[PDB]
DNA sequence: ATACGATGGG
DNA sequence: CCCATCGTAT
């Protein structure tokens, strides 16, 4: 018995690994019928990323037994750089032994590449992210959000996000002076705030600017905040699932 | 208060890109006629002079003349947080030692506000009189930038020789000797010459000057014996940027 | 004097990009038939052979044969001062040690003139005589460049295996094993008399693929116990061949 | 941290 | 064929 998943849009998988490799190097892929789930904290335990790819998003998905694949994300991103952006990527793992096979098929079907990747024995054991609801939920174009985080990183190392019914404000402050970006509430080009209470948290731009490498996956990003609680930045992945990143304040 | 609104914020970004490599600190001389800036490079080899007329701005209010001392490095960094289509507004209030930059998104949902510490600085030069020059070459700026880049791969100095018909640029080094000869033709070369001239300049400086290239599709070289070269970039309905380089 | 005018100067810029990484010094063999150049890499693993026929030039005059010794690094730097649409003219006078390059702008206002110091260097890489090979693979050059780049991320050597239907490229290292299998098919063409399996160093193949801009195809010719020939044809002038020993 | 060249995309 | 972005090299 074996795991095998075929993905006609191989570029999603290349984008997902770009969005993770800077933050994590090693992660356990939790493969099952429901699909692929991945959850890891950054080397420093400051942030946690959680990937969901549903079975239905794949063109073909067979999972005979659940597996816990430990994968070096650096290696896998390297192996994915040998996939053309228009290739059909297929992942295959046989329930015994320790190797993931990647197969990149050329649309023409004259070139077929076949990589075998050494898995890791990494003993993940990771917590439960429950459903939860937050004081302010900002929804905004991801490129705007990326740009905001890049700009303010030129002023300071920390950004102070302040949210109110009408608008969210991002601020940084350093040797050059102070910056202050104030978004107001407005195929995905407008800002939307759903807020129950107001909130003002401060985060490190270094981490937010890792999160924004997910930007190619999604035209929108969702920020959820509540006091003394990690920020959730979420990128929906087409009709497959999501990528969330949690960052603790201060 | 001083306040100037500029709908084409990308000019101001470009102006600061063209200066920051050459100067780090400069006193903006703000008045009703407009903004003037004039300053030598760190080594006093070259002098740059910026003119932005009041009428080039979309709004310009100058209650009292000021001398704003601004760190160009800091201001360029702050301008990198402006989108190329943003409306930039500069605002400085009598008394305060802080320049406000405000970048407004065309959509008008995102508005950025930066506040920049000013420096205490005085309007560091007067000079650069009106004169008429022996040879005035007018040429596509990208051609001129390319010429200065190419010859910098041969030598450290370029010898510019001008005659009625044409100007010639030459350099010489370890690899050999290069020689670009332009003939008289914002896509063509034009020479207005009263006398001929042959001056030698350092390419290191000319290659700073060419960072102004984005401001203008043409550049004007004015030359006369024993006198600094003027390289001028006219700015889209606002004014100019001139750089003076002494021969050698 | 020697004098050759080339309306498509970008070929000569490309030819020097394709050689400078592999060789730094080479003797240009100028003659009536045209320009020939032949030289081994610094470590004598590989030999490159350039052919530019007299008929490919827009003008070609060679009064007597010369052996111009040229620093390819210097000449590439000088060629970087040529616009991609310029007319390049090479001129050498029999008893001078200087090559003149002249770049004319299509407009003909901008004319650049460079003079380049020649070197006094011998000439013999012994070349390779023409032969017929067991497997000849013909394929898009950018595919071949990509293949060589990809597998260089897995291993340092590639094992090229050819059969009537298809060729396979394989590499193997710390990350694991890769394996690209092309089938005969813009398109891949195999002419094979016998099957062939040789192993080459990717370090070298990846220098060879700097010729890629010269040609939309590349030809690999192989036979046992004999160097691989990778050939790039040059637009109506000739070719660039690189031989790598297994 | 900054400035230039080379590359890929439009 | 030009530009902008990345990567490098100072």
Residue numbers in the entry:
A (entry chain B): 0 to 185, 191 to 254
B (entry chain A): 1 to 185, 192 to 254
C (entry chain C): 1 to 185, 193 to 253
Task: Reproduce text from the manuscript describing this model.
Here we have determined the crystal structure of human PCNA bound to a 10 bp long double-stranded DNA (dsDNA). We obtained crystals of PCNA–dsDNA complex with one PCNA trimer per asymmetric unit and diffracting to 2.8 Å resolution. The dsDNA molecule threads through the PCNA ring with its longitudinal axis and the C3 axis of the ring forming an angle of 15°. No crystal lattice contacts between DNA and symmetry-related molecules are present, and the crystal packing does not affect the DNA position. The high temperature factors of dsDNA are compatible with a partial occupancy of dsDNA and/or with the existenceof a subpopulation of complexes with slightly different DNA orientations. The complex interface involves the side chains of five basic residues (K20, K77, R149, H153 and K217), distributed on four α-helices of one PCNA subunit, and the side chain of another residue (K80) on the proximal α-helix of the adjacent subunit. The side chains of the PCNA interfacial residues form a right-hand spiral that closely matches the pitch of B-DNA, and are involved in polar contacts with five consecutive phosphates of a single DNA strand. The interacting side chains are able to switch between adjacent phosphates in a non-coordinated manner, supporting a helical sliding mechanism in which the clamp rotates and tilts by keeping a fixed orientation relative to the DNA backbone. In the MD trajectory, DNA migrates from the crystallographic position to an alternative position, and subsequently to a central location with minimal interactions with the protein, to eventually collapse into a stable state. Critically, the latter state can be obtained by shifting the crystallographic DNA model by two bases along the helical axis. Following this transformation, one DNA strand interacts with equivalent residues on the adjacent PCNA subunit.
